[PDB]
Amino acid sequence: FKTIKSDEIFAAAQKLMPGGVSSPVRAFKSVGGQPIVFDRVKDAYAWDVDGNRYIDYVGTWGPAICGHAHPEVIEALKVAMEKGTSFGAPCALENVLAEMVNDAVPSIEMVRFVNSGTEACMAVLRLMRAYTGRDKIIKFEGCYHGHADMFLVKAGSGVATLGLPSSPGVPKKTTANTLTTPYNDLEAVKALFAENPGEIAGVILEPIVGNSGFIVPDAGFLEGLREITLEHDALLVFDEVMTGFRIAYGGVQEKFGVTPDLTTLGKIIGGGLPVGAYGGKREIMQLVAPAGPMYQAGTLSGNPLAMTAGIKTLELLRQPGTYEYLDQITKRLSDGLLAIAQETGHAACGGQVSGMFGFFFTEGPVHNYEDAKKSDLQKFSRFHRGMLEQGIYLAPSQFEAGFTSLAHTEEDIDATLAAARTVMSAL
Amino acid sequence: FKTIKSDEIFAAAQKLMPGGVSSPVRAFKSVGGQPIVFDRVKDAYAWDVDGNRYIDYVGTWGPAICGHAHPEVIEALKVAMEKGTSFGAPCALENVLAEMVNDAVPSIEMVRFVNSGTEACMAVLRLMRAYTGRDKIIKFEGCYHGHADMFLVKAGSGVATLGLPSSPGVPKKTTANTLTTPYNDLEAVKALFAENPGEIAGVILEPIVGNSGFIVPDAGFLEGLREITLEHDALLVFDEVMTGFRIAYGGVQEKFGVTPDLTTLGKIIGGGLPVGAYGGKREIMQLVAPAGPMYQAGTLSGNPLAMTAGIKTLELLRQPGTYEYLDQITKRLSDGLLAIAQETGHAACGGQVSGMFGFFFTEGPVHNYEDAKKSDLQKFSRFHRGMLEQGIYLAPSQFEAGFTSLAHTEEDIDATLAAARTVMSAL
Ligand SMILES: Cc1ncc(COP(=O)(O)O)c(CN)c1O
Ligand SMILES: *Cc1c(COP(=O)(O)O)cnc(C)c1O
């Protein structure tokens, strides 16, 4: 397995950028070895700089649900760019995507496009506070909502993967308004409320965790959170940057049937380009400039190219059988990985909901962040490298959900199982 | 001048999005309240959904320094996308743009790409506090450094445009670690250090402000800042999201010879696409994950489409006599505007440094936000609308700098001045 070119480019990158990467999660610091430098991607595949071909399960961390370089999307962007990529003034396309989104997401009645999930989450951090008049926020341990200062507390994603402490550089003053609780622990939530009466602005959570591994909410947890927040006039905010348009067209809130007050969107909504969004009840959204007092701006927000990409993407997902196919092929995968784990004598747990799955090297079951931390990280490290040499590309971390796409085929699924069998037969 | 389509489109927009826009200033609230919706942009022009054409001086707020829909830039993008628009793993293009930026800007020895100037400013604040270990930052009135918590206090852009005050979802717990002095008040800065000794992480500012209208620093202002911060072992940070690659290839720091410890970039570096970056001294960048404990990530960061547009935009600026052409046409436009105001009996002051200009309806001079505010915004409002009907598109606000591009011709300049004469002969 040669990775000579990747090694050359990565080495160079390290003198130019911190850690040689543009995002901490791309670091192979925990999975052993160095990162693979991509060259191009298409459908369910990705090719590196040394010519090795891989079946992709990272899907650029979420956006590629329709498959990489989807022809219908790239032709729409080819035509689009002829007219300019950014205007700095309104454009009809913003109206089209805005309308599609209201229709798609149950809680969204008014929307505001932004440039990333991190931007969406920061904005909503502010609106949750501006609308309720309270300063404190409850976020769960292991969840991730961008890198805004206040969210850098018990964060999942690369902070988990890399074993980083909370922060550095964010004042105690600001971080003190962040109340944390273990995921799935309703009692812990009620305790924070009745201990800080009239102080909690709201609760923000990933409705289905993807950043501390794949963790589904316990029965009654989401309905319960809906209950305690209505009771104390607090806001229920869903961060659907990762689950939006993936678990279902309307996301987890539509699937599980629980409607929050505000939800943040990202990844899939951009279609491969930088696009984020936050929206919710009209009376809350009314506080955003230029309608209300809360000022939130962005130069490239709502630009034509980005709008074009999300539009075509949503139109593809809207096709019949979309989510039925994803569930079907993803179920075969998760189940298969589990059967092999057992067959080859390995403690493992995991599961899937539509096109998102997870696989842990631990007896489990996994309910929160502390549970996930019990997986065998050394086993995982050896299994990742093994899968990599067999031509399967998985996220370099035990703490990240895995993704499947409409471009993946039964064949691709089967070759992954065949490789998993081979890799796990050793370990 | 019919705006029927722009009218109905914007009317519909108000029902879907807060204010009917993606960024506050696009609503024309300080200039009458009726925006025009763009359909396409090319070279130095813009076209309406009504078929009207304008000579653009907004330039999508900075990005289009090479002219809209530049042929060489979009051809390069059309080629690039056939390889996928987002990888989620390293790519060679990150290396080349990174090397280019390290060579272009003096203070940068290591960079980290992001998706917007806002993300870069969030990151740089956190890194100034983490590197120094202090919590106080000195900002200036009228400077906009991204819609962030700690900084939404006397900010620029919409803030220093439609008089947006302090906070907007940011508590007294966030906007308290940030001190504030008037722009150009070196003595006020000195006081802040002596009055808060051993607890100032650093000073951040726009080296040339464009977010409170165009304002140049006085004689030894920046030089004072470098030294004072040097003596208290505090960091000097230049937010050159707007000035970078426009005032000069290495921005204001190159232009005026003053070197910050860090700088933030944006706008032009993505050439029309959502991109940002922050870099500076190696020893400080070394704290950024994964090379360090400070967390900062981003899903679309360093994506090939963005890197392509950035690389191509920089190649085009490195060509001979770029900034020389910019300075020449802009000085003509600047000097000509002022002359016309003087001959029609209107008080006005302004100026330009390369392809960035300012024009206020007050005799001034303008040295800070307070001065900028003594402008007759009612006259400006009518001025703007006259110009608009004369086929000239200007930033819909007195507190925003204007922009020139490499596609604006001598003739375009002569046509604007003619428009300006017909119009200023009213008011
Ligand atoms: C749940 C969640 N929210 C927010 C973010 C941050 O979004 P982005 O990376 O677009 O900045 C992420 C990114 N992995 C996420 O998964
Ligand atoms: C434009 C600008 C920003 C904001 O960047 P976005 O890309 O809109 O997030 C920050 N600082 C300055 C000085 C700016 O000009």
mmCIF file of C-alpha atoms in Angstrom, chain B residues 45-269:
data_model
loop_
_atom_site.group_PDB
_atom_site.id
_atom_site.type_symbol
_atom_site.label_atom_id
_atom_site.label_comp_id
_atom_site.label_asym_id
_atom_site.label_seq_id
_atom_site.Cartn_x
_atom_site.Cartn_y
_atom_site.Cartn_z
ATOM 1 C CA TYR B 45 -21.272 45.996 -14.151
ATOM 2 C CA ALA B 46 -24.448 44.587 -12.641
ATOM 3 C CA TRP B 47 -27.841 43.791 -14.095
ATOM 4 C CA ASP B 48 -31.290 43.983 -12.518
ATOM 5 C CA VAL B 49 -34.139 41.530 -12.620
ATOM 6 C CA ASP B 50 -35.708 44.408 -14.633
ATOM 7 C CA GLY B 51 -32.961 44.573 -17.236
ATOM 8 C CA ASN B 52 -31.307 47.714 -15.878
ATOM 9 C CA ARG B 53 -27.494 47.811 -15.969
ATOM 10 C CA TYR B 54 -25.278 49.560 -13.409
ATOM 11 C CA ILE B 55 -21.610 50.401 -13.033
ATOM 12 C CA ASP B 56 -20.801 48.672 -9.750
ATOM 13 C CA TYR B 57 -18.800 50.302 -6.971
ATOM 14 C CA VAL B 58 -19.819 47.781 -4.315
ATOM 15 C CA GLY B 59 -17.918 44.857 -5.952
ATOM 16 C CA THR B 60 -19.814 42.329 -3.812
ATOM 17 C CA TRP B 61 -18.201 44.090 -0.824
ATOM 18 C CA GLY B 62 -14.549 43.565 -1.743
ATOM 19 C CA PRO B 63 -14.183 40.099 -3.421
ATOM 20 C CA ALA B 64 -14.438 41.317 -7.016
ATOM 21 C CA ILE B 65 -11.182 43.289 -7.279
ATOM 22 C CA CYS B 66 -10.455 41.564 -10.647
ATOM 23 C CA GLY B 67 -13.914 42.335 -11.994
ATOM 24 C CA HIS B 68 -17.055 40.215 -11.725
ATOM 25 C CA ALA B 69 -17.210 36.866 -13.483
ATOM 26 C CA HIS B 70 -13.604 36.989 -14.467
ATOM 27 C CA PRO B 71 -13.068 34.597 -17.458
ATOM 28 C CA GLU B 72 -9.881 33.090 -16.118
ATOM 29 C CA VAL B 73 -11.327 32.596 -12.701
ATOM 30 C CA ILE B 74 -14.497 30.850 -13.761
ATOM 31 C CA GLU B 75 -12.749 28.639 -16.370
ATOM 32 C CA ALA B 76 -10.446 27.418 -13.632
ATOM 33 C CA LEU B 77 -13.471 26.658 -11.443
ATOM 34 C CA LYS B 78 -15.324 24.830 -14.229
ATOM 35 C CA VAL B 79 -12.288 22.569 -14.567
ATOM 36 C CA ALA B 80 -11.813 22.102 -10.851
ATOM 37 C CA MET B 81 -15.361 21.019 -10.057
ATOM 38 C CA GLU B 82 -15.145 18.020 -12.300
ATOM 39 C CA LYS B 83 -13.044 16.531 -9.487
ATOM 40 C CA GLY B 84 -15.544 17.173 -6.705
ATOM 41 C CA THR B 85 -16.143 20.428 -4.822
ATOM 42 C CA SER B 86 -15.386 19.127 -1.307
ATOM 43 C CA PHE B 87 -13.078 16.273 -0.091
ATOM 44 C CA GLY B 88 -13.003 16.339 3.690
ATOM 45 C CA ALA B 89 -9.343 15.380 3.536
ATOM 46 C CA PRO B 90 -6.163 17.245 2.605
ATOM 47 C CA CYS B 91 -5.543 18.299 -1.008
ATOM 48 C CA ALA B 92 -2.497 19.783 -2.731
ATOM 49 C CA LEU B 93 -4.299 23.083 -3.396
ATOM 50 C CA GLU B 94 -4.321 23.991 0.323
ATOM 51 C CA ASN B 95 -0.527 23.856 0.222
ATOM 52 C CA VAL B 96 -0.157 26.182 -2.768
ATOM 53 C CA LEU B 97 -2.569 28.906 -1.614
ATOM 54 C CA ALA B 98 -1.028 28.645 1.857
ATOM 55 C CA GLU B 99 2.433 29.176 0.418
ATOM 56 C CA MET B 100 1.185 32.071 -1.665
ATOM 57 C CA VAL B 101 -0.375 33.810 1.355
ATOM 58 C CA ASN B 102 2.777 33.287 3.455
ATOM 59 C CA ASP B 103 4.779 34.998 0.685
ATOM 60 C CA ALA B 104 2.247 37.809 0.097
ATOM 61 C CA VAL B 105 1.656 39.026 3.665
ATOM 62 C CA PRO B 106 4.633 40.009 5.924
ATOM 63 C CA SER B 107 3.368 38.902 9.330
ATOM 64 C CA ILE B 108 2.162 35.496 8.117
ATOM 65 C CA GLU B 109 4.458 32.496 8.498
ATOM 66 C CA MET B 110 1.667 29.952 8.968
ATOM 67 C CA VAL B 111 -2.039 30.139 7.945
ATOM 68 C CA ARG B 112 -5.318 28.400 8.698
ATOM 69 C CA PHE B 113 -8.089 28.761 6.138
ATOM 70 C CA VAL B 114 -11.698 29.097 7.268
ATOM 71 C CA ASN B 115 -14.981 29.936 5.570
ATOM 72 C CA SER B 116 -15.427 33.594 6.310
ATOM 73 C CA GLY B 117 -13.838 36.647 7.903
ATOM 74 C CA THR B 118 -16.164 36.157 10.904
ATOM 75 C CA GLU B 119 -14.723 32.690 11.599
ATOM 76 C CA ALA B 120 -11.165 34.090 11.306
ATOM 77 C CA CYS B 121 -11.923 36.913 13.785
ATOM 78 C CA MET B 122 -13.476 34.429 16.289
ATOM 79 C CA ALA B 123 -10.355 32.297 16.005
ATOM 80 C CA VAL B 124 -7.821 35.138 16.254
ATOM 81 C CA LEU B 125 -9.448 36.585 19.401
ATOM 82 C CA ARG B 126 -9.342 33.218 21.086
ATOM 83 C CA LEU B 127 -5.713 32.756 19.998
ATOM 84 C CA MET B 128 -4.710 36.193 21.252
ATOM 85 C CA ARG B 129 -6.162 35.330 24.666
ATOM 86 C CA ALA B 130 -4.721 31.798 24.703
ATOM 87 C CA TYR B 131 -1.238 32.861 23.706
ATOM 88 C CA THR B 132 -0.975 35.720 26.178
ATOM 89 C CA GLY B 133 -3.115 34.186 28.894
ATOM 90 C CA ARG B 134 -5.015 37.426 29.410
ATOM 91 C CA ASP B 135 -8.669 38.264 28.832
ATOM 92 C CA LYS B 136 -8.891 41.966 27.889
ATOM 93 C CA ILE B 137 -8.810 43.046 24.242
ATOM 94 C CA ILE B 138 -8.834 46.628 22.985
ATOM 95 C CA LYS B 139 -11.166 47.227 20.028
ATOM 96 C CA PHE B 140 -11.973 50.578 18.348
ATOM 97 C CA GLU B 141 -15.256 52.401 17.739
ATOM 98 C CA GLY B 142 -16.446 51.866 14.195
ATOM 99 C CA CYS B 143 -14.383 48.752 13.467
ATOM 100 C CA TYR B 144 -16.309 45.662 12.387
ATOM 101 C CA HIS B 145 -14.577 42.368 13.156
ATOM 102 C CA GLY B 146 -17.342 39.869 12.416
ATOM 103 C CA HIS B 147 -20.776 39.345 13.930
ATOM 104 C CA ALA B 148 -19.392 37.917 17.144
ATOM 105 C CA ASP B 149 -20.257 38.172 20.831
ATOM 106 C CA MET B 150 -17.205 39.739 22.477
ATOM 107 C CA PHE B 151 -16.988 42.263 19.636
ATOM 108 C CA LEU B 152 -20.522 43.478 18.957
ATOM 109 C CA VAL B 153 -19.819 46.701 20.839
ATOM 110 C CA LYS B 154 -19.524 49.861 18.719
ATOM 111 C CA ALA B 155 -18.742 47.670 15.692
ATOM 112 C CA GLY B 156 -18.684 48.699 12.036
ATOM 113 C CA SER B 157 -20.714 47.866 8.921
ATOM 114 C CA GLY B 158 -24.435 47.774 9.765
ATOM 115 C CA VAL B 159 -23.492 48.745 13.320
ATOM 116 C CA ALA B 160 -21.575 51.787 12.110
ATOM 117 C CA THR B 161 -24.225 52.386 9.421
ATOM 118 C CA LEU B 162 -27.686 52.021 10.956
ATOM 119 C CA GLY B 163 -26.458 52.832 14.455
ATOM 120 C CA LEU B 164 -26.585 49.309 15.858
ATOM 121 C CA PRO B 165 -25.454 49.595 19.517
ATOM 122 C CA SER B 166 -23.868 47.067 21.865
ATOM 123 C CA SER B 167 -24.678 43.391 22.414
ATOM 124 C CA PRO B 168 -27.218 41.766 20.008
ATOM 125 C CA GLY B 169 -27.245 38.514 21.914
ATOM 126 C CA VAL B 170 -23.924 39.150 23.599
ATOM 127 C CA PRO B 171 -24.084 39.501 27.413
ATOM 128 C CA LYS B 172 -22.298 41.930 29.698
ATOM 129 C CA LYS B 173 -20.294 38.785 30.439
ATOM 130 C CA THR B 174 -18.978 38.680 26.875
ATOM 131 C CA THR B 175 -18.679 42.379 26.015
ATOM 132 C CA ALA B 176 -16.696 43.205 29.187
ATOM 133 C CA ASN B 177 -13.414 41.489 28.310
ATOM 134 C CA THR B 178 -13.278 43.987 25.434
ATOM 135 C CA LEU B 179 -12.129 47.543 26.014
ATOM 136 C CA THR B 180 -12.865 50.301 23.486
ATOM 137 C CA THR B 181 -11.071 53.505 22.442
ATOM 138 C CA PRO B 182 -11.823 55.932 19.613
ATOM 139 C CA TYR B 183 -10.111 55.239 16.313
ATOM 140 C CA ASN B 184 -6.870 57.239 16.079
ATOM 141 C CA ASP B 185 -6.721 57.942 19.807
ATOM 142 C CA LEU B 186 -3.237 56.735 20.676
ATOM 143 C CA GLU B 187 -3.479 58.415 24.116
ATOM 144 C CA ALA B 188 -6.734 56.611 24.906
ATOM 145 C CA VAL B 189 -5.014 53.323 24.116
ATOM 146 C CA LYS B 190 -2.118 54.219 26.443
ATOM 147 C CA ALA B 191 -4.559 54.939 29.240
ATOM 148 C CA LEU B 192 -6.332 51.560 28.816
ATOM 149 C CA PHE B 193 -3.013 49.730 29.469
ATOM 150 C CA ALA B 194 -1.956 51.866 32.409
ATOM 151 C CA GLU B 195 -5.477 51.547 33.851
ATOM 152 C CA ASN B 196 -5.678 47.763 33.237
ATOM 153 C CA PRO B 197 -2.027 46.712 33.640
ATOM 154 C CA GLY B 198 -0.953 43.115 33.097
ATOM 155 C CA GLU B 199 -4.353 42.021 31.753
ATOM 156 C CA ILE B 200 -4.566 43.157 28.103
ATOM 157 C CA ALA B 201 -4.093 40.281 25.609
ATOM 158 C CA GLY B 202 -3.797 42.752 22.763
ATOM 159 C CA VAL B 203 -5.251 45.256 20.288
ATOM 160 C CA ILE B 204 -7.111 44.422 17.072
ATOM 161 C CA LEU B 205 -8.126 46.957 14.441
ATOM 162 C CA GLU B 206 -8.775 47.558 10.760
ATOM 163 C CA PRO B 207 -5.443 49.100 9.585
ATOM 164 C CA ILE B 208 -7.560 51.349 7.352
ATOM 165 C CA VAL B 209 -11.217 51.414 8.269
ATOM 166 C CA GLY B 210 -13.806 50.889 5.610
ATOM 167 C CA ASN B 211 -16.573 49.801 7.970
ATOM 168 C CA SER B 212 -17.404 53.356 9.269
ATOM 169 C CA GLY B 213 -16.858 54.799 5.842
ATOM 170 C CA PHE B 214 -13.261 55.095 4.629
ATOM 171 C CA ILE B 215 -10.876 56.406 7.381
ATOM 172 C CA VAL B 216 -7.086 56.418 7.173
ATOM 173 C CA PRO B 217 -4.882 56.309 10.295
ATOM 174 C CA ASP B 218 -3.109 59.486 11.349
ATOM 175 C CA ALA B 219 0.634 60.048 10.981
ATOM 176 C CA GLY B 220 2.169 57.727 13.593
ATOM 177 C CA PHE B 221 -0.939 55.946 14.795
ATOM 178 C CA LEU B 222 -0.160 52.352 13.788
ATOM 179 C CA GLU B 223 3.487 52.869 14.693
ATOM 180 C CA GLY B 224 2.467 53.920 18.183
ATOM 181 C CA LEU B 225 0.240 50.844 18.503
ATOM 182 C CA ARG B 226 3.036 48.479 17.542
ATOM 183 C CA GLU B 227 5.378 49.900 20.160
ATOM 184 C CA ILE B 228 2.943 50.266 23.029
ATOM 185 C CA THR B 229 1.744 46.697 22.600
ATOM 186 C CA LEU B 230 5.351 45.583 22.249
ATOM 187 C CA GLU B 231 6.183 47.055 25.660
ATOM 188 C CA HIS B 232 3.371 45.290 27.540
ATOM 189 C CA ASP B 233 4.030 42.018 25.718
ATOM 190 C CA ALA B 234 0.652 42.297 24.069
ATOM 191 C CA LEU B 235 -0.312 41.244 20.549
ATOM 192 C CA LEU B 236 -1.120 43.637 17.708
ATOM 193 C CA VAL B 237 -3.644 42.168 15.324
ATOM 194 C CA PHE B 238 -4.624 43.599 11.927
ATOM 195 C CA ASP B 239 -8.086 42.673 10.578
ATOM 196 C CA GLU B 240 -7.338 42.974 6.878
ATOM 197 C CA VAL B 241 -10.384 41.093 5.644
ATOM 198 C CA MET B 242 -11.182 44.234 3.695
ATOM 199 C CA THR B 243 -7.762 45.815 3.189
ATOM 200 C CA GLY B 244 -5.878 42.593 2.365
ATOM 201 C CA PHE B 245 -4.884 42.251 -1.288
ATOM 202 C CA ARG B 246 -6.573 45.616 -2.049
ATOM 203 C CA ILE B 247 -4.580 48.451 -0.477
ATOM 204 C CA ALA B 248 -1.598 46.403 -1.590
ATOM 205 C CA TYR B 249 -0.615 42.758 -2.226
ATOM 206 C CA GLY B 250 0.565 42.519 1.380
ATOM 207 C CA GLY B 251 -2.194 44.895 2.478
ATOM 208 C CA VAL B 252 -1.729 47.884 4.754
ATOM 209 C CA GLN B 253 1.117 46.247 6.736
ATOM 210 C CA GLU B 254 3.156 46.118 3.552
ATOM 211 C CA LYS B 255 1.906 49.516 2.385
ATOM 212 C CA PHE B 256 2.771 51.321 5.620
ATOM 213 C CA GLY B 257 5.524 49.069 6.905
ATOM 214 C CA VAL B 258 3.974 48.195 10.256
ATOM 215 C CA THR B 259 3.898 44.476 11.135
ATOM 216 C CA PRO B 260 1.202 42.928 13.408
ATOM 217 C CA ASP B 261 1.705 39.661 15.258
ATOM 218 C CA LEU B 262 -1.363 38.183 13.476
ATOM 219 C CA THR B 263 -3.769 39.223 10.737
ATOM 220 C CA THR B 264 -7.117 37.994 9.493
ATOM 221 C CA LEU B 265 -8.009 37.834 5.805
ATOM 222 C CA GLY B 266 -11.109 37.167 3.763
ATOM 223 C CA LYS B 267 -13.145 38.577 0.977
ATOM 224 C CA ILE B 268 -10.628 38.715 -1.938
ATOM 225 C CA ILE B 269 -8.758 35.550 -0.869
#
